[PDB]
């Protein structure tokens, strides 16, 4: 029942989920879904397709200096040996990519010109860790090693199950990003429609010419181009008619009618965030509970009574949602100045070092005390708007080392859909912006009368 | 309690209920100490409830295992569960080793496929 789920999102704000199930026999499987169909793949196959890597590199990546962890060593031996025994061939990344391309040809509608090697590169670029994007295979390799370490820590009992229904591990789909995703999907289907139309031309009538403007204009007139009408249908019905399916659960009820009974109703229409229609038809009631993680982000009071109680909650009136990607390029340069060892030539692992990670991309490794110091310094320089590399909206989601608690590490976040609230930074007395991920570890007094010395920072 | 129990009783008449219990009246000549001792000697005790830790020293120098079993102190687990050295040795020799062999061979047959 263990696993690791990451919801990677492309730069055009499209989502792709990659899970890492654990098998009791010692092998980890990689699960994704291209169309409305689930596909399973051994984790070492993708780990070898990502880059030219040996088996000693995988071992030294998933295991750091703790070669004496018999749990880790036995799990890794079983995993590597099982891959080598199930697929005795595929000794090189080229062979692994070719095998992946052979595995996925009809599912991806790959063209006959597409070689198997480049089809494997295509599935690699469109499935595993899409947020790293193309030309980020080394980063995807490091992130997969990190996720395997974290899964082994989870099954070893050294980590706690991150709560999916806690606001600490949630964001909000803004509803304009959903519009953009559906537009991208519809124009993709439009391209597929014109390709299928020329396919029917080929199969029926030999009169074709891919250089004829008359032929182009004649075949385009035989396809459907009412993307606007399809968008109007989506807005009118709420149904998400998708041939591929988004990374979402429900298929209907995405658009509500903004009622105008009074201005209070109208304004609250634009402040409500829903859990989903999935949880309305259910019996488990742990998802409706009011949790401390919603302090300052979700309203404790404003929630309807009856069926939608606990699911149709509203934001605090000072809860800001980031719709723009923050300038993050020079933050890695700042981090290396603070003491973060670069993630290219460090060779460290395990939950005994702080994994400094920016927007789902590993930046480096550093001790826990130094990670705490770095988080404090980033907060100080973020509130004090002198350093040009640190936007005020940066969410410094530090997680300290505990005993069987959460997985430690420094998790800097930027980008869209984040939940942000203004809170007064007590040193130098200036406004600060915090998110749900970092809030649950920082002390935030509710009134200046009750600040405790060396306790509260905000 | 409540609706789940009313369901178990009058809605489906389940032969296997969630919490099967039976009440045992006691003789008035049995002290509470004797009643508690009887409760301990009647309640079940698994083998895992006297185990401190298990160390498996696997050596392939033909693939062996040296399964050292560590128990609590005798004057502790005998007092807690009324289980002695003789009964512990008997269960280990008869049922534990047999189940271990069965699990090992089943896993071996599974790994062939």
């Amino acid at each position: 029942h263990y696993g690791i789920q990451i919801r990677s999102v492309r730069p055009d704000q499209t989502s792709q989920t990659n899970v890492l199930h654990y098998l009791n026999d010692g092998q980890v499987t990689f699960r994704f879904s291209w169309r409305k169909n689930e596909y399973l793949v051994p984790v070492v196959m993708i780990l070898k397709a990502l880059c030219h890597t040996s088996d000693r590199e995988i071992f030294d990546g998933i295991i750091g200096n703790d070669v004496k962890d018999s749990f880790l060593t036995d799990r890794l031996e079983l995993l590597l040996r099982g891959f080598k025994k199930r697929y005795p061939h595929l000794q090189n990344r080229t062979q692994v990519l070719q095998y992946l391309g052979d595995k996925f040809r009809v599912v991806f509608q790959a063209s006959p010109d597409q070689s198997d090697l480049e089809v494997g590169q295509e599935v690699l670029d469109r499935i595993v860790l899409v947020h790293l994007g193309k030309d980020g295979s080394q980063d995807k390799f490091r992130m997969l090693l990190f996720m395997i370490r974290k899964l082994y820590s989870l099954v070893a009992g050294e980590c706690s199950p991150d709560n999916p229904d806690a606001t600490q591990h949630q964001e909000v789909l803004l509803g304009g990003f959903l519009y953009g995703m559906i537009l991208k999907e519809k124009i993709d289907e439009y391209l597929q429609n014109i390709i299928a139309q020329v396919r029917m031309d080929i199969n029926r009538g030999m009169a074709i010419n891919f250089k004829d403007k008359r032929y182009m204009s004649r075949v385009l007139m035989r396809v459907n181009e009412n993307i606007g009408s399809k968008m109007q249908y989506f807005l009118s019905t709420g149904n998400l008619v998708s041939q591929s399916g988004l990374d979402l659960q429900q298929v209907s009820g995405y658009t509500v009618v903004a009622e105008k009974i009074n201005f209070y109703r109208f304004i609250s229409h634009f402040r409500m965030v829903h859990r989903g229609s999935f949880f309305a038809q259910l019996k488990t009631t742990t998802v409706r509970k009011l949790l401390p993680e919603s302090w300052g982000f979700l309203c404790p009071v404003h929630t309807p009574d009856g069926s939608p109680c606990g699911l149709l909650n509203h934001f605090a009136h000072k809860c800001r949602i980031s719709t723009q990607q923050s300038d993050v390029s020079r933050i890695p340069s700042i981090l290396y100045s603070l003491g973060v060892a670069p993630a290219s030539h460090t060779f460290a692992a395990g939950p005994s070092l702080c994994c400094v990670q920016i927007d789902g991309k590993i930046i480096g490794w550093v001790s826990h005390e130094q990670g705490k110091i770095i988080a404090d310094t980033l907060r100080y320089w973020k509130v004090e708007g002198k350093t040009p590399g640190l936007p005020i909206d940066l969410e410094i989601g530090y997680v300290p080392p505990s005993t069987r608690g959460q997985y430690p590490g420094l998790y800097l976040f930027g980008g869209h859909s984040r939940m942000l609230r203004p809170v007064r930074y007590l040193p130098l007395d200036k406004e600060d912006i915090v998110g749900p991920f970092e809030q649950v570890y920082m002390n935030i007094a509710v009134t200046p009368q009750e600040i405790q010395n060396n306790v509260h920072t905000h | 309690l409540g609706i789940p129990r009313l369901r178990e009783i009058v809605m489906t008449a389940s032969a296997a209920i969630k919490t099967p219990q039976m009440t045992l009246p006691i003789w008035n000549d049995v002290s509470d100490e004797q009643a508690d001792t009887f409760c301990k000697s009647i309640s079940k005790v698994l083998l895992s409830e006297v185990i401190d830790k298990v160390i498996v020293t696997e050596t392939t120098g033909a693939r062996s295992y040296v399964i050292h079993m560590r128990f609590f102190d005798n004057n502790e687990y005998s007092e807690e569960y009324d289980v002695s050295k003789e009964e512990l040795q008997n269960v280990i020799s008869n049922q534990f080793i047999h189940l271990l062999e069965a699990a090992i061979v089943k896993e071996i047959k599974k790994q062939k496929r």
Binding site: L191, V198, I202, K211, N226, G228, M231, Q232, F270 | -
Partner: protein, 148 residues
């Protein structure tokens, strides 16, 4: 002092003559900031916007003709630019249509969606570009694709 106060005079003045510089109550618009920002980000911002990024990520899907190793001439259709126009009407030179008109007509308030298709053949031997109307794309009020 006074803990609270009716702002009778300024309320009456602002009712009689609305502001010409900016809307009072800035907090009333920071509430709908998420939706407006989400819709604005798909047609503006760095790298051209979310729609341009999406059509870049989609790429091209190709087909062959089978005419005489050699499967024939390729047809790599793709999109590289998506533009949204503020809603207009043709009732000539196009005028501006307002959401008041949309509500009164009991019809939608939709702009015009234009995609330039890239009818590439044989890996860039010749490219037949063409923009094309794709129906009416509904737009959200007070967004950069609205006249308000």
């Amino acid at each position: 002092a006074r803990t609270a106060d009716f702002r009778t005079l300024e309320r009456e003045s602002r009712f009689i003559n609305p502001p010409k510089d900016k809307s009072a109550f800035p907090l009333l618009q920071e509430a709908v900031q998420p939706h407006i920002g989400s819709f604005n980000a798909l047609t503006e911002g760095p790298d051209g916007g979310l729609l341009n990024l999406g059509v870049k990520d989609i790429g091209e899907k190709v087909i062959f003709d089978g005419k005489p190793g050699y499967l024939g001439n390729k047809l790599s259709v793709s999109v590289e630019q998506v533009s949204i126009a503020k809603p207009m009407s043709n009732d000539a030179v196009e005028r501006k249509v307002y959401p008041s008109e949309s509500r009164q007509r009991l019809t939608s308030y939709r702009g015009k969606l234009l995609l330039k298709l890239k009818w590439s053949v044989n890996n860039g031997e010749e490219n037949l570009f063409e923009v094309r109307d794709c129906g009416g794309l509904p737009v959200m009020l007070q967004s950069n694709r609205c006249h308000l």
